[PDB]
Write an enzyme that holds these catalytic residues in place. Structure first.
Site, PDB file in Angstrom:
ATOM      1  N   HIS A 275       7.721   5.771  34.692  1.00  0.00           N
ATOM      2  CA  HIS A 275       7.984   6.751  36.085  1.00  0.00           C
ATOM      3  C   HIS A 275       9.477   7.406  36.334  1.00  0.00           C
ATOM      4  O   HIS A 275       9.710   7.811  37.590  1.00  0.00           O
ATOM      5  CB  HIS A 275       7.160   6.506  37.368  1.00  0.00           C
ATOM      6  CG  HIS A 275       7.873   5.035  37.909  1.00  0.00           C
ATOM      7  ND1 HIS A 275       9.044   4.854  38.467  1.00  0.00           N
ATOM      8  CD2 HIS A 275       7.369   3.487  38.046  1.00  0.00           C
ATOM      9  CE1 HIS A 275       9.024   3.615  38.682  1.00  0.00           C
ATOM     10  NE2 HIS A 275       8.207   3.015  38.700  1.00  0.00           N
TER      11      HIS A 275
ATOM     12  N   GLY B 140      14.210   0.518  44.161  1.00  0.00           N
ATOM     13  CA  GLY B 140      15.594   0.107  42.973  1.00  0.00           C
ATOM     14  C   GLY B 140      15.294  -1.097  42.444  1.00  0.00           C
ATOM     15  O   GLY B 140      15.453  -0.756  40.525  1.00  0.00           O
TER      16      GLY B 140
ATOM     17  N   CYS C 189      12.017  -2.030  40.533  1.00  0.00           N
ATOM     18  CA  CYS C 189      11.845  -0.796  38.999  1.00  0.00           C
ATOM     19  C   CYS C 189      13.055  -1.498  37.927  1.00  0.00           C
ATOM     20  O   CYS C 189      13.775  -0.727  37.637  1.00  0.00           O
ATOM     21  CB  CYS C 189      11.129   0.231  39.205  1.00  0.00           C
ATOM     22  SG  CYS C 189      10.127   0.469  41.340  1.00  0.00           S
TER      23      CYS C 189
HETATM   24  O1  LIG Z   1       6.321   1.429  44.882  1.00  0.00           O
HETATM   25  C1  LIG Z   1       7.412   2.547  44.157  1.00  0.00           C
HETATM   26  C2  LIG Z   1       8.818   1.524  43.544  1.00  0.00           C
HETATM   27  C3  LIG Z   1       9.225  -0.216  44.256  1.00  0.00           C
HETATM   28  C4  LIG Z   1       8.971  -1.130  43.801  1.00  0.00           C
HETATM   29  N1  LIG Z   1       9.061  -1.879  44.882  1.00  0.00           N
HETATM   30  C5  LIG Z   1       9.071  -2.299  45.708  1.00  0.00           C
HETATM   31  C6  LIG Z   1       9.418  -0.832  46.930  1.00  0.00           C
HETATM   32  C7  LIG Z   1       9.756  -1.513  48.003  1.00  0.00           C
HETATM   33  C8  LIG Z   1      10.044   0.003  48.627  1.00  0.00           C
HETATM   34  C9  LIG Z   1       9.470   1.153  47.550  1.00  0.00           C
HETATM   35  C10 LIG Z   1       9.521   1.730  46.557  1.00  0.00           C
HETATM   36  C11 LIG Z   1       9.505   0.378  46.202  1.00  0.00           C
HETATM   37  N2  LIG Z   1       7.004   3.691  43.965  1.00  0.00           N
HETATM   38  C12 LIG Z   1       8.164   4.393  42.890  1.00  0.00           C
HETATM   39  C13 LIG Z   1       9.330   5.551  44.149  1.00  0.00           C
HETATM   40  C14 LIG Z   1       9.499   6.791  43.717  1.00  0.00           C
HETATM   41  C15 LIG Z   1      11.276   6.321  43.781  1.00  0.00           C
HETATM   42  C16 LIG Z   1      11.902   7.736  42.731  1.00  0.00           C
HETATM   43  C17 LIG Z   1      11.393   8.573  42.195  1.00  0.00           C
HETATM   44  C18 LIG Z   1       9.680   8.723  41.990  1.00  0.00           C
HETATM   45  C19 LIG Z   1       8.811   7.152  42.205  1.00  0.00           C
HETATM   46  C20 LIG Z   1       6.318   4.704  43.691  1.00  0.00           C
HETATM   47  C21 LIG Z   1       4.927   4.491  43.401  1.00  0.00           C
HETATM   48  C22 LIG Z   1       3.345   4.594  43.133  1.00  0.00           C
HETATM   49  C23 LIG Z   1       2.620   4.381  42.263  1.00  0.00           C
HETATM   50  C24 LIG Z   1       3.070   3.542  41.398  1.00  0.00           C
HETATM   51  S1  LIG Z   1       5.079   3.818  41.350  1.00  0.00           S
END
Ligand SMILES: O=C(Cc1cncc2ccccc12)N(CCC1CCCCC1)Cc1cccs1
Ligand SMILES: O=C(Cc1cncc2ccccc12)N(CCC1CCCCC1)Cc1cccs1
Ligand SMILES: [Cl-]
Lengths: 306, 306
Positions: B41, B143, B145
């Site tokens: 992603h 951040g 990930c």
């Molecule tokens: O959940 C997360 C990351 C994440 C991880 N741990 C903690 C997190 C806490 C808050 C927010 C986000 C977190 N995703 C990524 C967010 C985007 C950031 C910019 C670029 C595109 C993706 C959403 C997804 C949906 C389906 C699969 S991933």
């Protein structure tokens, strides 16, 4: 989201762990630049431990009586000196893995990571706090002496603890990296007891703010309290007194969540009175006191889950 | 003495963490040999995440569209390919700090250490378990990930988890290092929920043995039970079934403490039906299930990883 007891990454400290042997005694040493730091009781036999005269025991040792092993390499000891309860072995090689570091003496309530080691080899890393009675509730077996506690705020390793002993209640006592013990302990086998331990009030409040930041508010109430009335109640549950310094330190967390420090104190008074009634706070059925206000800000989001 | 939630020393993994940037998205990557592994992603914008066609999104990317930073050095991406939900960036330089490693897929109940990272820089290390519902109760912010979970078995790092997302309940989902998700999760911004979780029974029993080893024995009783009667009771409290494999795995702890596994099962049955009655076990008012039998033996015997 989530709130875990989080230790600092231990790599910077792992590259400093060495094995120190003096006669039949083997423990851990911390190799920084060209000096290996270790508990001075490495020069004792179990028969010396009641009333050791460390100056007398040390004067009888030459440099070649100290065997320092870093991985599978033997370091050459070219000098030795004692500073309080720490032995400093000068070696002929500066540690190439020496991180940016400093020695800091901490206060009760402060948290730090412990890299538990045996025979100069790291076994595990955990988080703990300097208890109000100056002990740490560590996880240490015989041979763990010389294992260190540290914090790694912004690439610099601040070494704050070196493990020396286990008290009869299973808790641990040690020194800062200048060899000064935390608390009224001595590096003798004489009868020593940890004083009655208390809960680190400022840390419980910090953790309640972490709970609000992560979305939980069930424990809040409509009440407030004066600082003096809170302390009168808190002392009855063996909680440390909350000072104006603690209230000031909780200011940022109070501003972020919108819950005044003395309003969070009222919530804590109620929690002490009622218990949790089958509920949990951040996955815990006890009030957690090993997260400082600084730890909560570092770990938690800057955006509260309203 | 003492029993802490202890993570493996993280140094071997810290030397593998890199920052991966694709456009406006920055996350963490794991650099092993000449390949950097990261969540696929990283090629998505928030809009792409709604319904991504990863093969189509990846087709549009050149090697230079991926910026990989290892410390203050930029690595050159010379190839890219996708394996399930992981992106593999071939780089021109093999990581000189690549430890002996393997990719392993763990089972629910197994524990591992997570090295939480932001911008390719390790921030903390914590121990957690793969829940029976295939989520992890981690501590992750935006951040994080690409942060990985691992174990060390002798001198070999077994990478078992890569962080991809957070579910609405604040729990986390990710994949093994071959990009296969743990649990019925997908890497898309869509409605997903963690299923009802259960307690890891074999781990609670392991932790009760750790409490006994540490001198906490108040919960022991004269009773035993059958594996069938214990499982009938355990099913009622949303505890995972205890198998004969679990009983066999607890054999060493049963022999060391003198408490047969079904003898400890009868203690656990009583604890489920009556609670703790104001008492704690290893400083906890809840039955802890994130220590495996192997973790207990390792911590109680001081196993090291130099
Ligand atoms: O959940 C997360 C990351 C994440 C991880 N741990 C903690 C997190 C806490 C808050 C927010 C986000 C977190 N995703 C990524 C967010 C985007 C950031 C910019 C670029 C595109 C993706 C959403 C997804 C949906 C389906 C699969 S991933
Ligand atoms: O408590 C320990 C070690 C220790 C540490 N952490 C945890 C421990 C758990 C069990 C037993 C021991 C532990 N002392 C050191 C024992 C050595 C002394 C020199 C010869 C070889 C054994 C006792 C004293 C130190 C200072 C004053 S009395
Ligand atoms: Cl301090």
């Amino acid at each position: 989201s989530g709130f875990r007891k989080m230790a600092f990454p231990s790599g910077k400290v792992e590259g400093c762990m060495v094995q120190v042997t003096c006669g039949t005694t083997t423990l851990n040493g911390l190799w920084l630049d060209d000096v290996v730091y270790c508990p001075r009781h490495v020069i004792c036999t179990s028969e010396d431990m009641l009333n050791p005269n460390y100056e007398d025991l040390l004067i009888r040792k030459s440099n070649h009586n100290f065997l320092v092993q870093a991985g599978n390499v033997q370091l050459r000891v070219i000098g030795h000196s004692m500073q309080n309860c720490v032995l400093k072995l000068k070696v002929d090689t500066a540690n190439p893995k020496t991180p940016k570091y400093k020695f800091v003496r901490i206060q009760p309530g402060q948290t730090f990571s412990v890299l538990a080691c045996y025979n100069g080899s790291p076994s595990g890393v955990y988080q703990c706090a300097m208890r109000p009675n100056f002990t740490i509730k560590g996880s240490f077996l015989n041979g763990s002496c010389g294992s260190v506690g540290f914090n790694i705020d912004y690439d610099c390793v601040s070494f704050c603890y070196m493990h020396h002993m286990e008290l009869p209640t299973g808790v641990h006592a040690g020194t800062d990296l200048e060899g000064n013990f935390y608390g009224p302990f001595v590096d003798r086998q004489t009868a020593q007891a940890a004083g009655t331990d208390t809960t680190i009030t400022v840390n419980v409040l910090a953790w309640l703010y972490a709970a609000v930041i992560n979305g939980d508010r069930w424990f809040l109430n409509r009440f407030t309290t004066t600082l003096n009335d809170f302390n009168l109640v808190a002392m009855k549950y063996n909680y440390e007194p909350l000072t104006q310094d603690h209230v000031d330190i909780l200011g940022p967390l109070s501003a972020q969540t919108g819950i005044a420090v003395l309003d969070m104190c009222a919530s804590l008074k109620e929690l002490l009175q009622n218990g949790m009634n089958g509920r949990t706070i951040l996955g815990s059925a006890l009030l957690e006191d090993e997260f400082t206000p600084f730890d909560v800000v570092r770990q938690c989001s800057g955006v509260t889950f309203q």
